[PDB]
Amino acid sequence: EVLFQGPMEMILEEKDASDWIYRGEGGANLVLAYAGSSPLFVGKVIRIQKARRNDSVLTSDEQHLWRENNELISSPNKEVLEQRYVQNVIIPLLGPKHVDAGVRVSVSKEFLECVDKKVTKQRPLWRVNAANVDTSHDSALILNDHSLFDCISVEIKPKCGFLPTSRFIGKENMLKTSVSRFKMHQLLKLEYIEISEESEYDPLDLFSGSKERVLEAIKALYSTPQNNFRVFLNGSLILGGSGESTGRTSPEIGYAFEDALKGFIQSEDGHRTECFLQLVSDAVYGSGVLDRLLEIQKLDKLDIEGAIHCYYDIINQPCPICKEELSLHALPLDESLKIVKEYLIAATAKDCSIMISFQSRNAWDSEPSGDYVSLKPTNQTFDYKVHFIDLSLKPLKRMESYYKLDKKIISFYNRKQKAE
Ligand SMILES: O=P(O)(O)O[C@H]1[C@H](OP(=O)(O)O)[C@H](OP(=O)(O)O)[C@@H](OP(=O)(O)O)[C@H](OP(=O)(O)O)[C@H]1OP(=O)(O)O
Ligand SMILES: Nc1ncnc2c1ncn2[C@@H]1O[C@H](COP(=O)(O)OP(=O)(O)O)[C@@H](O)[C@H]1O
Ligand SMILES: [Mg+2]
Ligand SMILES: [Mg+2]
Ligand SMILES: [Zn+2]
């Protein structure tokens, strides 16, 4: 026998940084995959928060809003919040099967700064302009790298795949009930130069439940990936934009990708991509994962056009939008909470993403499994995982900014359609 320190919360010192590599990133988090050898972190990624350079856990109204869970609102810092929110809110609605909720790790302000320097190269100019890494969390989250187990993993950020029916949408905003917000949004994204090409994808095809509308969706995506489609080869990008959105696939990158699916997809040159896509579509349609998700999203029972009102009650500030419908203000404050919390929850579900791993059975290391795909026209069997990512809680305050963003979306669409 020998004597060792008692147990202690691991801490990531200013030396472990060179173990991590740039993965991707959103508006809210950094993500780096693991390159070092320590068994603990192998097959893991670190999700490190950043700070918009114009910047306690929960505001007073957010405490009351999420109060139905004492452990949640009493979160020290945002990693526990992130943990408890997936743990006691999301998985109840979503099921633990396709979420792999996260583990905290302490980190030194020095470690962060080291990662911050190490990625800036791989990061997109305007992401560097808009946010460095937030070097005053003590913590960060470690997750299973949902592109591992050759392993081909594809990521789909579906967005909201239903159309509202609220009695509070106005005649003028009548389009909102027949055009997905995603399509209209695209117009506003084009005017602001954030894409080059209106995207072929319509999340209605994905959330339709038609094994045939879904393949169109997956076909659309590969065509115009923007920032909703990504395909990896063992932790590397091969289709999609890294940390950002990317222009329509071209003849040159489709012929590059194509010659990449070599030896994973077994089909003659110029046939693998149409195969790979059938595979993705069938993983998505077969796993049924996309269904329960669209149930969460539909906790938007009133659309932001009606929900904003309940928001102004919550924060007990007189309602701007009204102009002298009591109906929504005459609610008991308790009911007005439920709509806004269910709104926020729904927001988590429209902004989340799906990762799908693959292990071809044409490789001898094949650990079979009851979730798999048999791709009829090449005779290959593929075992696959489907997991969620970016189930972050959203701030009560984005409500106001949500309403404004909606207004501009349906105002601007109405516009370009009046032209004709
Ligand atoms: O950058 P991404 O990783 O893609 O995600 C960003 C936002 O996430 P946050 O980082 O939490 O803000 C996301 O959710 P929000 O927080 O706004 O609810 C937005 O969705 P929407 O605004 O609701 O439509 C995104 O817009 P679309 O991707 O076009 O949906 C995008 O905004 P950006 O372009 O300014 O970064
Ligand atoms: N657990 C994970 N496994 C593999 N890739 C991930 C994981 N988490 C995030 N990523 C990748 O890094 C990106 C970071 O985004 P995300 O974690 O959703 O934070 P944000 O709030 O910034 O959108 C994702 O779009 C995803 O492709
Ligand atoms: Mg994201
Ligand atoms: Mg997020
Ligand atoms: Zn009102």
Side-chain angles (χ1 to χ4, degrees):
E1 207 36 43
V2 187
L3 174 67
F4 4 55
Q5 325 244 8
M8 57 185 72
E9 271 174 304
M10 148 126 47
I11 292 173
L12 277 197
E13 285 299 7
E14 177 180 344
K15 118 84 193 188
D16 318 274
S18 86
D19 265 31
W20 303 94
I21 54 204
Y22 181 54
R23 174 45 71 85
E25 79 190 73
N29 287 105
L30 235 83
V31 176
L32 351 178
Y34 190 69
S37 334
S38 203
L40 273 46
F41 304 105
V42 164
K44 309 320 182 54
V45 299
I46 215 190
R47 165 184 236 236
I48 300 166
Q49 216 156 8
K50 44 198 203 163
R52 295 269 156 163
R53 301 170 182 251
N54 40 29
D55 281 28
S56 285
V57 237
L58 305 176
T59 82
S60 213
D61 299 317
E62 302 193 277
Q63 254 176 69
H64 194 78
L65 188 94
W66 305 94
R67 79 185 173 312
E68 328 273 22
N69 204 264
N70 325 323
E71 10 149 352
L72 183 66
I73 59 167
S74 77
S75 289
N77 80 342
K78 284 258 174 174
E79 280 72 15
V80 153
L81 178 45
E82 175 63 9
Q83 266 174 355
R84 283 183 212 172
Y85 174 83
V86 170
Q87 194 60 244
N88 314 136
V89 189
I90 293 299
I91 317 202
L93 298 148
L94 205 71
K97 175 185 169 211
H98 297 141
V99 173
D100 265 16
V103 168
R104 303 188 313 264
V105 67
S106 331
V107 293
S108 71
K109 175 279 184 44
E110 354 133 323
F111 173 62
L112 302 172
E113 283 174 330
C114 268
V115 169
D116 184 21
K117 302 189 186 183
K118 187 183 180 113
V119 268
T120 304
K121 308 93 178 205
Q122 304 90 249
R123 272 171 101 245
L125 177 47
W126 69 286
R127 295 296 211 188
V128 196
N129 295 331
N132 62 326
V133 104
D134 183 335
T135 37
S136 77
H137 290 12
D138 48 344
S139 284
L141 272 164
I142 308 291
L143 323 196
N144 299 316
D145 179 16
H146 283 340
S147 55
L148 282 224
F149 229 72
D150 292 5
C151 167
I152 274 261
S153 23
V154 33
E155 175 204 1
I156 294 182
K157 187 161 159 208
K159 300 320 296 232
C160 176
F162 81 85
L163 321 191
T165 76
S166 168
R167 295 164 175 176
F168 308 103
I169 307 158
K171 166 178 9 179
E172 45 287 328
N173 315 318
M174 188 59 70
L175 282 175
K176 301 186 47 172
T177 80
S178 61
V179 188
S180 83
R181 133 196 254 261
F182 179 90
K183 283 250 216 221
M184 301 184 268
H185 199 17
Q186 291 280 293
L187 287 208
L188 194 39
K189 284 167 176 281
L190 259 176
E191 186 103 345
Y192 270 111
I193 302 298
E194 270 172 56
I195 35 163
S196 2
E197 62 293 290
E198 146 147 30
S199 186
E200 318 214 57
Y201 170 66
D202 194 315
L204 307 180
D205 298 321
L206 216 58
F207 293 104
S208 71
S210 148
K211 183 227 298 183
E212 246 124 338
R213 265 177 85 179
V214 170
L215 193 98
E216 291 296 74
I218 304 301
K219 272 244 178 193
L221 296 177
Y222 156 91
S223 310
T224 65
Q226 284 186 16
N227 93 309
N228 311 102
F229 200 39
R230 299 174 162 106
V231 190
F232 309 68
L233 174 47
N234 311 330
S236 166
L237 224 42
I238 65 146
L239 203 87
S242 180
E244 56 183 324
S245 157
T246 197
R248 166 185 306 272
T249 303
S250 53
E252 266 68 27
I253 236 300
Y255 293 175
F257 184 93
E258 166 71 344
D259 292 324
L261 297 176
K262 106 172 188 313
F264 177 92
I265 307 282
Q266 236 180 297
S267 181
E268 300 89 18
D269 258 42
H271 276 254
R272 294 177 288 279
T273 285
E274 49 185 339
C275 280
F276 164 71
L277 292 183
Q278 167 70 352
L279 152 74
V280 173
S281 187
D282 255 320
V284 173
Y285 179 88
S287 57
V289 43
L290 215 52
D291 298 326
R292 174 72 62 57
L293 171 78
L294 168 73
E295 220 172 309
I296 292 51
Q297 305 193 352
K298 283 173 152 147
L299 285 177
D300 203 353
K301 293 186 275 304
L302 322 192
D303 179 66
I304 194 45
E305 217 173 300
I308 204 66
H309 300 277
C310 301
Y311 167 89
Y312 278 104
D313 284 347
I314 291 317
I315 78 186
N316 167 40
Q317 164 158 15
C319 179
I321 337 251
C322 291
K323 72 312 133 203
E324 69 270 4
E325 240 315 290
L326 81 97
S327 184
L328 257 232
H329 297 308
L331 277 180
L333 165 104
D334 245 4
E335 212 55 43
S336 269
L337 290 172
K338 188 171 165 305
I339 278 174
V340 192
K341 181 227 256 203
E342 273 157 358
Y343 192 110
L344 288 180
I345 288 229
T348 296
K350 330 197 209 183
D351 138 274
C352 90
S353 305
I354 306 175
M355 317 250 318
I356 305 164
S357 326
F358 292 101
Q359 172 211 217
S360 188
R361 290 232 185 105
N362 303 31
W364 58 258
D365 92 311
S366 296
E367 301 296 287
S369 131
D371 312 307
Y372 61 79
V373 174
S374 295
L375 177 60
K376 96 159 224 165
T378 47
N379 195 29
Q380 9 211 170
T381 289
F382 290 105
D383 303 281
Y384 76 89
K385 323 183 167 137
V386 191
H387 288 101
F388 289 82
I389 64 182
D390 204 349
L391 316 198
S392 282
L393 170 132
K394 307 248 174 298
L396 209 67
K397 184 48 176 177
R398 222 133 286 199
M399 295 291 303
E400 199 178 350
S401 126
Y402 286 150
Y403 180 94
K404 263 163 270 166
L405 179 36
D406 204 77
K407 197 153 145 31
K408 196 50 213 162
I409 275 178
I410 199 47
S411 145
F412 183 74
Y413 199 72
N414 280 8
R415 192 163 258 278
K416 306 244 337 173
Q417 289 329 329
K418 243 217 82 75
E420 42 72 15

